[PDB]
Design a binder for this molecule. Structure first.
Ligand SMILES: NC(=O)c1ccc[n+]([C@@H]2O[C@H](COP(=O)([O-])OP(=O)(O)OC[C@H]3O[C@@H](n4cnc5c(N)ncnc54)[C@H](O)[C@@H]3O)[C@@H](O)[C@H]2O)c1
Ligand SMILES: NC(=O)c1ccc[n+]([C@@H]2O[C@H](COP(=O)([O-])OP(=O)(O)OC[C@H]3O[C@@H](n4cnc5c(N)ncnc54)[C@H](O)[C@@H]3O)[C@@H](O)[C@H]2O)c1
Ligand SMILES: NC(=O)c1ccc[n+]([C@@H]2O[C@H](COP(=O)([O-])OP(=O)(O)OC[C@H]3O[C@@H](n4cnc5c(N)ncnc54)[C@H](O)[C@@H]3O)[C@@H](O)[C@H]2O)c1
Ligand SMILES: NC(=O)c1ccc[n+]([C@@H]2O[C@H](COP(=O)([O-])OP(=O)(O)OC[C@H]3O[C@@H](n4cnc5c(N)ncnc54)[C@H](O)[C@@H]3O)[C@@H](O)[C@H]2O)c1
Lengths: 328, 336, 328, 336
């Protein structure tokens, strides 16, 4: 049985050892160390070779990465981009803001602010607040100018070439169009990583589709085909892992997909929600076990924390140390 | 300036005076009192008489529901339909007290499943392994037997068959709201929220309607009877036009997530809601939309700068029935 | 097994029935109904007559009421006053602010404000913020004028009459001095309900003792005797119940006292804390069971909510309906 | 204006660059970066040379500790001493990097008990009944065998005997801080926070020192050896004078409760702290002092209006070691 003991700074600042010490520090530091172990187990399983019996290359473990939209507003956008760039995860799930703001960041930046800035004076200057971040309205003007010709082409392809659009197919197209290596969705489509977002209309992309539909009516986004697509990613996996940042639709959609295989083998939740309100967001991993979304023999972990603090540290201690195994 | 003073139980127990005293008790009790005031302001504006032409509003919004002097959007996370708040919401919809509903997929399907089989009380700490081994699914401190979903399957599959047939031969272009209206008509049960919503021409928006058991069933059904399409674009047009052609709007939002953003973003299209009450347990510090204060929404234009929005930081299962008791339920004589 | 079902407003607004329906509404409404049941069980046990074998009158169950200081800033001060006035609880525990602000409210009121008011402009006008409440600085001036002559007498009594002051003895004296039926501590001392507050110096009372000690040095407040006094309240009880609003010292001090009898028989927590940070505040009742602070056979309840919303409703459904049993 | 940008792992893993990138990552990562800046400002001011007279400051504050150019108050809730943050705090005290400690009683006693027996890792969900039946006590996801407290009893009772004897025949008037200094000297172990605090003349305030196991032991001891008195009034004088006669003050407060208010209220006596960092998981909505934002303290005069205080909303077991790594631990050459 393992003793509580924190990092001793009389050793100097040995960063790897400082991070390794979270495991024996207690409370959420210990859960962070457990999450490192769960993700490294996902990775080790993924890198094992496939048996006989056992367009994206299939691996020995399929990793679903989910994140709420605000994390793409944050600099965790870079963290996610890196993982997608190097084919370290296999399926992305995010809400609509998490798609559009990645693209918009290729046209204009987001800025630091404070949570307490007052909306009246912000609105008067055309500045929109996302937590302690700030997005000028002009950013969305630029998005409009960029996106509208693409909506024109998608409608034409729908009506003259038989294309049946879904959120994931639109997201791949937008990633191809943005054509920018800073963009998560550019790498996702380049690497054949599907992106699911069933409420893709809930955001600025929706605004633009809405306005567009009055000059160029008839665009259809079907969510049924995308439900088949995400569920089959789980059903035909040798192994699955879930890494879920935040809650809401993203968290349920990944977990429910994995119910179709009688549960994920590995699971890490990082979120700030709590169970007491009965929310899905705040449900503990053990709630998911009752449904079959996480296997009974799994050892899932939740870290109760803002992912903007934890996720880059998690990546540093897991994926980033196995980078070579993921290249060329 | 208003003094802090709690209810004095030397008066005995008058529950109305007790709830009214929330306003001067402080902290979230005070915000509850402010929320009562904001909702009563919405209702008061809604009940003012109107004079507008019936044909152009139906053409612009593509809806059969008459305009009133204030359009009220009610949103709730799915789990509140698992709870007994389902009865609270059903009452409001039954009496045409709100005008637009927004909920995630679970908030649709579990209202229907409750007409087939009940949900039970449990505890948050019940272990998943033993529950799974007995076919019991946990929702917070509630429990749903798996057999409930089997009954749901049997009820729903013939309806999905008809929907595909209507799509392919009668030109129907399904969306979530149109499906939700049809499911409410089929369930044909006065305990159901969506039975009343469709009967009263109250639309229900749920853009991620595949994220739950209804999705499971659509998925399974599609391998027996392929082809169903659910378009979210037309439903975006429908919700936004409800805000655009409103004379006045109020937002009452229980919980966060999709529901909260979808209602607020629709109201951006009219440069902001006139009244807004949030009841949710989220906090701002994580940058989340769920946890964003009303004043964040003001920066975007989702809430008018001149509005007096209120957030109550609390579990809505505690607060929403009390809020309805002090607002809509006092005005039911006007609502008929 | 009990079905989920909310109050049906087609019945009209039947307030008692609306409150009774919280039990079957789920999430924290259900925990509220459970708390009503636990408190009513405390009360029923307290009102049972004492056996042969089995200055405050001893009853069949000793109820400890704890609350954080801010709840006395709130209007829950009236709720607590009522219970103390009618001898419905037996021991009070609160932090220092929870003593002084009760007294100050007899000299000048507290006002409603908002959480977002900015401290600079408040400080410039001599207005102090407590959450969404406001206390003018003048309130504390009035407190100073009222309190200083009492500190003079306590020192004199210490040095010439052998008095050994403790927090609970000072609180009883201050309640006698305030001589005002709106005050919690007036009723507490009148009804021989002891009040424990081991960090009594942490607040305005401390400020005043601090300043006083420079003109009239030597006042001693011993916390050891007060530890014996609260622990013996638990040790020699036939039965104990704990009703704890908020966390911190108050929650631990009551629970630790009841460890000395191998645990409380009944327990209700109402607080907004969560367990994930390892805090005592956020510890669930079942953590206390591991120490022996709550008996293994007890059925404790936590309601996760702001007590300013819940506690008056709890009192309405429990103590207030048994008022007759507590009088004359 | 500063752009949002996360650390780019195409650079490889440079942990310093990774922590520095917190500042531009947003949400609480940004507040962490601001907290690093505030603490480094405190340290920088502390290390400025001073010229003040040694005798009058010792007379006014009744302390042997020399004044520096900034007095840093470090507060932490008890559970952080249960955690491995105990080692973080011990390092700071060992090297005289902070000037005043404030903690609740558990934060005193468990530092001493850890020199006698360890605390172990467990899980939050372990059931109390089975733990109680095996003499294991739960602290969050940590576990303390009851035997740890038996060892504590045996170590402490002879010390309590000496304290009573010194009170009754050598005129000693015990207070919490004076007791804590004596316990640190007796534990005589370089792993102990309070061993280092007393050796370096860093006072420790804990006005409710009876609320925990030390209280249990004082209680039991008093029926064998009556008479110990612990006065909190003189300790109020001692902490307040540390603020009053400071040239500059900074507050670093982990958690809420007594600790947070006691430090901030001491700093009111000088019309406010110059620097302040809160790290805690509390929220404002419940009116709590724990959850009060720094700007509430500004309204009282506890934080100067010209200061730039920062709160990081997070479990300090995650954040405090990183904060120390980026601040105090980089400056240890100056601190010798
Ligand atoms: N919860 C269910 O019963 C259920 C059923 C089937 C599917 N799902 C799916 O789960 C997904 C996520 O659900 P969601 O985003 O709609 O909500 P959620 O349950 O994830 O809640 C989002 C946030 O809303 C707030 N909230 C939740 N419950 C609250 C309460 N009782 N009082 C106040 N505030 C509260 C909280 O801040 C919470 O983090 C949806 O797509 C849904 O279809 C859930
Ligand atoms: N930037 C934005 O936030 C943004 C922009 C456009 C649209 N939207 C829309 O808002 C709607 C709702 O968003 P949602 O459900 O995706 O997420 P959300 O922001 O509401 O968050 C849901 C829950 O996830 C958790 N969470 C959030 N941020 C976290 C963090 N940093 N660390 C840990 N946990 C965290 C919290 O418990 C929160 O209650 C969407 O449909 C989305 O498209 C958001
Ligand atoms: N916790 C223990 O191990 C322990 C041991 C013996 C006695 N006690 C007694 O319990 C009483 C109450 O403890 P308290 O008021 O000092 O603290 P607490 O544990 O009650 O915490 C108070 C608040 O501080 C904040 N906090 C706690 N842990 C945090 C963390 N890890 N990171 C950030 N913020 C955090 C939270 O908002 C919390 O509600 C004290 O009198 C103490 O002596 C506790
Ligand atoms: N008005 C004041 O708050 C005030 C005034 C003077 C002094 N002080 C001092 O502040 C110090 C710390 O206060 P504390 O530990 O007593 O309490 P606190 O206010 O810090 O609260 C401790 C915890 O109790 C819970 N809590 C608080 N308010 C709640 C509510 N309304 N509903 C439910 N739960 C709630 C929260 O989890 C909170 O973290 C004291 O020693 C006190 O004397 C406070």
């Amino acid at each position: 049985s393992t003793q509580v003991r924190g990092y001793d700074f009389n050793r100097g600042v040995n960063y790897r050892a400082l991070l390794e010490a979270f495991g024996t520090t207690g409370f959420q530091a210990t859960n962070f160390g457990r999450a490192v172990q769960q993700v490294n187990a996902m990775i080790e399983k993924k890198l094992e070779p496939l048996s006989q019996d056992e367009r994206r290359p299939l691996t020995s473990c399929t990793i679903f990465l989910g994140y709420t939209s605000n994390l793409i507003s944050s600099g965790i956008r870079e963290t996610i981009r890196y993982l997608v760039q190097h084919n370290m995860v296999d399926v992305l799930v995010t809400t609509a803001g998490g798609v559009e703001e990645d693209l918009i960041k290729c046209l204009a930046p987001t800025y630091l602010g404070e949570f307490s800035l007052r909306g009246k004076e912000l609105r008067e200057n055309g500045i929109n607040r996302i937590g302690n971040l700030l997005v000028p309205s002009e950013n969305y003007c630029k998005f409009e100018d960029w996106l509208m010709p693409i909506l024109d082409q998608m409608v034409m392809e729908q009506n003259t070439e038989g294309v049946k659009w879904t959120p994931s197919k639109m997201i791949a197209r937008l990633g191809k169009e943005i054509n920018n290596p800073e963009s998560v969705y550019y790498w996702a489509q380049k690497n054949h990583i599907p992106v699911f977002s069933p409420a893709l209309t809930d955001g600025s992309l929706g605004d633009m589709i809405f306005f567009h539909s009055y000059k160029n009516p008839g665009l259809v986004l079907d969510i049924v085909e995308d439900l088949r697509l995400i569920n089959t990613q789980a059903i035909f996996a040798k192994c699955t892992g879930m890494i879920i940042l935040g809650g809401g639709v993203v968290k349920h959609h990944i977990a429910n997909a994995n119910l179709m295989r009688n549960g994920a083998d590995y699971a890490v939740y990082i979120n700030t929600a709590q169970e007491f309100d009965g929310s899905d967001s705040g449900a503990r991993p053990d709630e998911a076990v009752s449904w079959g979304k996480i296997r009974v023999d799994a050892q899932p972990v939740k870290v109760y924390a803002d992912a903007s603090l934890v996720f880059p540290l998690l990546v540093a201690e897991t994926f980033a140390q196995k980078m070579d195994a993921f290249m060329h």
